[PDB]
Amino acid sequence: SGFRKMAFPSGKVEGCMVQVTCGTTTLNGLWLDDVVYCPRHVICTSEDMLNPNYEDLLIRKSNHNFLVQAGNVQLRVIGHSMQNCVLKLKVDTANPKTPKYKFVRIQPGQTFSVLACYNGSPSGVYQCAMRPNFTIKGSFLNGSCGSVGFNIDYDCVSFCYMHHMELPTGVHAGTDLEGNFYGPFVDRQTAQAAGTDTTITVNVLAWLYAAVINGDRWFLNRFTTTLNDFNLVAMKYNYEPLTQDHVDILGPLSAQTGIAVLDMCASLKELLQNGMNGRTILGSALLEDEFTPFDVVRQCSGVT
Amino acid sequence: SGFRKMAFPSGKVEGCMVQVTCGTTTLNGLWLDDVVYCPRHVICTSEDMLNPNYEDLLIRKSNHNFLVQAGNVQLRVIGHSMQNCVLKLKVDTANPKTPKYKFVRIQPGQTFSVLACYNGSPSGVYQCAMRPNFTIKGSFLNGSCGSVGFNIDYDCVSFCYMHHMELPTGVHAGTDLEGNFYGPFVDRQTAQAAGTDTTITVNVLAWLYAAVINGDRWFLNRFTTTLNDFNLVAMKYNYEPLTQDHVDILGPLSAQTGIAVLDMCASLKELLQNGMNGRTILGSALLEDEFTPFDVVRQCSGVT
Numbered sequence: 355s356g357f358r359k360m361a362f363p364s365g366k367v368e369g370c371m372v373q374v375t376c377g378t379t380t381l382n383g384l385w386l387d388d389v390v391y392c393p394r395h396v397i398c399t400s401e402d403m404l405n406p407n408y409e410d411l412l413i414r415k416s417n418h419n420f421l422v423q424a425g426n427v428q429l430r431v432i433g434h435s436m437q438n439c440v441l442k443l444k445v446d447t448a449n450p451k452t453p454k455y456k457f458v459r460i461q462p463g464q465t466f467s468v469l470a471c472y473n474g475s476p477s478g479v480y481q482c483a484m485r486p487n488f489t490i491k492g493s494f495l496n497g498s499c500g501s502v503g504f505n506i507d508y509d510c511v512s513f514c515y516m517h518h519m520e521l522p523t524g525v526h527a528g529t530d531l532e533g534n535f536y537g538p539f540v541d542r543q544t545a546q547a548a549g550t551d552t553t554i555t556v557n558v559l560a561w562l563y564a565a566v567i568n569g570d571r572w573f574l575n576r577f578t579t580t581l582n583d584f585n586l587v588a589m590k591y592n593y594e595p596l597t598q599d600h601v602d603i604l605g606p607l608s609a610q611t612g613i614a615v616l617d618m619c620a621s622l623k624e625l626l627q628n629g630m631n632g633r634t635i636l637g638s639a640l641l642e643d644e645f646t647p648f649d650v651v652r653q654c655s656g657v658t
Numbered sequence: 659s660g661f662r663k664m665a666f667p668s669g670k671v672e673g674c675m676v677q678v679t680c681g682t683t684t685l686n687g688l689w690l691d692d693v694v695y696c697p698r699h700v701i702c703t704s705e706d707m708l709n710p711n712y713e714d715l716l717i718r719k720s721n722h723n724f725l726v727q728a729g730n731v732q733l734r735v736i737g738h739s740m741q742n743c744v745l746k747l748k749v750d751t752a753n754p755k756t757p758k759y760k761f762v763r764i765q766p767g768q769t770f771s772v773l774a775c776y777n778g779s780p781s782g783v784y785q786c787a788m789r790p791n792f793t794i795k796g797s798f799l800n801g802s803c804g805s806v807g808f809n810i811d812y813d814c815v816s817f818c819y820m821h822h823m824e825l826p827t828g829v830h831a832g833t834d835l836e837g838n839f840y841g842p843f844v845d846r847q848t849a850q851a852a853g854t855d856t857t858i859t860v861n862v863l864a865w866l867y868a869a870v871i872n873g874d875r876w877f878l879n880r881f882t883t884t885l886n887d888f889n890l891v892a893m894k895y896n897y898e899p900l901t902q903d904h905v906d907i908l909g910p911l912s913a914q915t916g917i918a919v920l921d922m923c924a925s926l927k928e929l930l931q932n933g934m935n936g937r938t939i940l941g942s943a944l945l946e947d948e949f950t951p952f953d954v955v956r957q958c959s960g961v962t
């Protein structure tokens with residue numbers, strides 16, 4: 355038993371990280387088959403980043419202006435093109451460690467593992483949720499751009515995120531692997547708002563079920579509620595509305611615990627109104643919303 | 659910026675996990691050079707585990723009674739021996755993916771990454787601290803034994819933990835890679851006490867410095883204190899005593915922030931006495947003690 359925020363094993367993705375340098379700017383690239391993917395602001399100087407015209411900047415760059423380094427070795431860049439906010443560098447060598455992979459655009463509320471890298475080398479791995487406002491709460495320093503987010507299913511890596519920038523609130527923003535930002539953001543160093551960050555209600559309920567599965571049961575109260583009545587509570591607290599789709603997704607955890615989803619909703623309502631009175635749930639004094647129902651099921655069933 | 663619990667990249671350790679089966683019992687083994695390391699209770703039936711005589715049980719086992727599987731392939735077991743609570747199986751093939759490695763016995767308060775595995779296959783990675791009472795708060799199900807804890811320095815994996823059991827409190831216990839338990843525990847399915855779990859004071863202070871580095875400063879008060887006066891506070895709350903060795907270890911974070919260590923101690927004292935009044939520090943409503951000063955420095959400096 356026990357319940358922990360846990361990332362996927364990172365080995366398949368470590369084999370795909372390279373270093374990309376253009377002029378003075380160095381960042382990380384993702385090397386799959388004979389293409390290296392990286393954020394297009396690798397072509398910017400510090401001044402450019404304030405207000406970049408990426409088309410005009412890129413037109414001054416040739417293949418040989420991109421230095422791509424895999425460990426000790428230089429890759430030869432044989433072509434380049436910009437797709438939305440990502441740059442694709444064609445190289446003369448297919449990555450021999452390319453795993454089976456696909457590119458996915460993930461939904462708000464879903465989670466993924468970040469392999470944080472600097473200079474093409476992995477530094478650590480942690481789990482993030484795509485928030486409903488399309489930001490993530492990561493840990494990123496200068497040089498971390500091009501670090502990627504991913505999920506594993508069996509032996510297929512599903513890449514879903516590439517890191518580009520930090521917002522004034524300290525949260526993080528990036529694109530899918532087609533270079534399209536999650537959220538309303540642009541890759542320019544100007545102040546940008548993500549708007550109200552709402553709580554992923556279905557995830558909090560999955561985490562409460564995780565707490566019950568692991569013996570934490572003090573917060574279970576004697577009430578039930580309805581969906582419409584709960585959502586009137588939910589929206590007062592900037593929680594996302596709960597739907598029958600969410601109820602069904604929670605079905606298996608509801609069955610494991612014998613706790614109806616609407617019974618758990620009433621338990622959540624009283625936590626929202628009364629707080630936790632200094633108690634803890636799974637070692638936290640906040641309600642946690644970055645575990646999906648699948649995250650709870652896979653952790654509590656030993657999926658490999 | 660941002661601060662997250664993050665594990666080391668797991669790729670070097672994934673290449674060392676195998677499956678070990680003896681009779682009906684299956685668990686994980688660590689394959690380095692021509693030796694596989696695993697918990698000795700792989701030789702027990704369910705009944706044996708209640709009160710095992712490991713010497714007598716092992717004497718009924720021959721090399722061919724240990725099935726060791728690396729992916730699809732069987733390894734041939736050419737010898738075996740018990741070292742404390744671990745079994746060493748000599749195999750006829752050196753692991754071609756053996757990384758540079760060593761075995762270390764870690765100190766209470768230090769952290770490490772767990773690569774949780776089932777059936778020889780990695781399932782996820784998370785960070786743990788060796789608590790002062792020599793338990794860890796992990797996430798482990800049946801079949802997870804032989805999962806290992808490790809740290810990376812450059813390209814050397816330092817293995818420090820192998821998983822063996824769960825205590826009645828839900829915390830976890832295991833050995834170093836020489837098979838010696840951390841703590842007073844024995845590998846028998848009988849109720850065992852770990853005793854009072856005290857808080858890793860130097861780690862809480864490192865985490866408060868991490869909070870300041872990342873812009874969280876509301877808890878800084880106008881007081882200072884002394885070591886002896888703080889430790890009178892510390893011991894009332896089951897915190898570990900703070901020493902000049904800890905002060906010096908915190909030196910670099912103290913310098914980064916301009917906050918004297920004893921000033922931060924006085925800030926901690928008021929948090930201990932008054933609580934957090936519903937505020938949060940680095941997104942937590944508890945004081946976090948599973949980040950070492952080195953963990954904070956390495957995260958806040960981009961070490962790879």
Ligand SMILES: *[C@H](O)[C@H](C[C@@H]1CCNC1=O)NC(=O)[C@H](CC(C)C)NC(=O)OCc1ccccc1
Nearest residue numbers: 395403494495496497498499518519520541542
């Ligand atoms: C890519 O490595 C970088 C990641 C920033 C590093 C600071 N924390 C991060 O997540 N991205 C940028 O520097 C980005 C470049 C623009 C052309 C989009 N600019 C940026 O994020 O400005 C915010 C910022 C905050 C704190 C320090 C530096 C920049």
Ligand SMILES: *[C@H](O)[C@H](C[C@@H]1CCNC1=O)NC(=O)[C@H](CC(C)C)NC(=O)OCc1ccccc1
Nearest residue numbers: 699707798799800801802803822823824845846
């Ligand atoms: C090795 O896979 C296993 C790990 C236990 C799995 C339950 N959670 C764990 O961490 N170890 C044992 O089953 C251990 C074997 C003895 C010979 C030491 N026994 C054990 O941990 O008993 C506690 C327990 C708690 C909950 C379920 C099963 C066992």
Ligand SMILES: [Cl-]
Nearest residue numbers: 437438439533
């Ligand atoms: Cl665009």
Ligand SMILES: [Cl-]
Nearest residue numbers: 358359662663
């Ligand atoms: Cl965490």
Ligand SMILES: [Cl-]
Nearest residue numbers: 741742743837
């Ligand atoms: Cl022993």
Ligand SMILES: [K+]
Nearest residue numbers: 575577617621
């Ligand atoms: K209820």
Ligand SMILES: [K+]
Nearest residue numbers: 879881921925
């Ligand atoms: K102070």
Ligand code: NA
Nearest residue numbers: 459530532534
């Ligand atoms: Na897209």
Ligand code: NA
Nearest residue numbers: 763834836838
């Ligand atoms: Na030892």
